[PDB]
GROMACS .gro file of C-alpha atoms in nm:
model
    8
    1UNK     CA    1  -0.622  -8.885  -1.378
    2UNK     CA    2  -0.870  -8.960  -1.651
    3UNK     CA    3  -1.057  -8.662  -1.743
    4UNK     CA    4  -1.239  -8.584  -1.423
    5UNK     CA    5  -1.232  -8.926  -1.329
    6UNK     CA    6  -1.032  -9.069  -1.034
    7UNK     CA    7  -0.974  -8.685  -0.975
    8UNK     CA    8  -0.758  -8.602  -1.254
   0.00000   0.00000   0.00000
């Protein structure tokens, strides 16, 4: 979602 953060 954010970058690799939260998934993508």
């Amino acid at each position: 979602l954010v970058x690799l953060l939260i998934x993508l």
